[PDB]
Structures are given as structure tokens and as C-alpha cells.
Symmetry: C3
Subunit: 33 residues, 3 copies
């Protein structure tokens, strides 16, 4: 059960992480547009 | 070895998200040249 | 104990990866200014 809990918690964190940084990049694009 | 293998599969996953984000940053960078 | 260790190693890499990308993004923000 726990290893399956782990797999779930990681894919999710990785998704937020990816998006958290992509936003920093999106603001830069809008700015220097 | 089963959990170790799991570590390597997730590690492979982060290096890819890392590189995938860097490319979006490299695109803008290439434009800013 | 092997699951706990795998978490530590995964959280560390995710933490580093994030900042290593933000540091690259900051270099680009400097090229713009
Ligand atoms: Cl650090
Ligand atoms: Cl640091
Ligand atoms: Cl660092
Ligand atoms: Cl820093
Ligand atoms: Ni530090
Ligand atoms: Ni830093
Ligand atoms: Ni550092």
C-alpha cells in the first residue's frame, strides 16, 4: 500500500513542480512580449 | 533491487522534466540572442 | 526503511532540480535587463 502511496505522491509533486517553474517562464514571456 | 529499480525509474523521470523545462527556457534564450 | 530512504533521495533531487532551473531562469532575466 505504501509504495503505491509513494508513486502517487511523486507524479503529483512533479506535476506541480513543472507548472510552478513554467509559470515563472510564462510571466517572462508576457513581460518581454 | 525492487525499490532500487523504482528509484532509478523516478530519477529518470525528474531528469526529463528538468531537461524539458530547460528547453522552454533555451527557446526564449535563443530568441533573445 | 528502504522505502523511507528512496523518499529522501527523491525529495532531494526534486528540490535541487527546481532551484537549478530557477537559477538558469534568473540568468536569462539578467540578459533581458
Ligand atoms: Cl541547496
Ligand atoms: Cl544553493
Ligand atoms: Cl543550487
Ligand atoms: Cl538561489
Ligand atoms: Ni542549499
Ligand atoms: Ni540558487
Ligand atoms: Ni546551490
Amino acid at each position: 500500500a505504501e509504495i503505491e502511496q509513494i508513486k502517487k505522491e511523486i507524479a503529483y509533486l512533479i506535476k506541480k513542480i513543472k507548472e510552478e517553474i513554467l509559470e515563472e517562464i510564462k510571466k517572462i514571456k508576457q513581460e518581454i512580449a
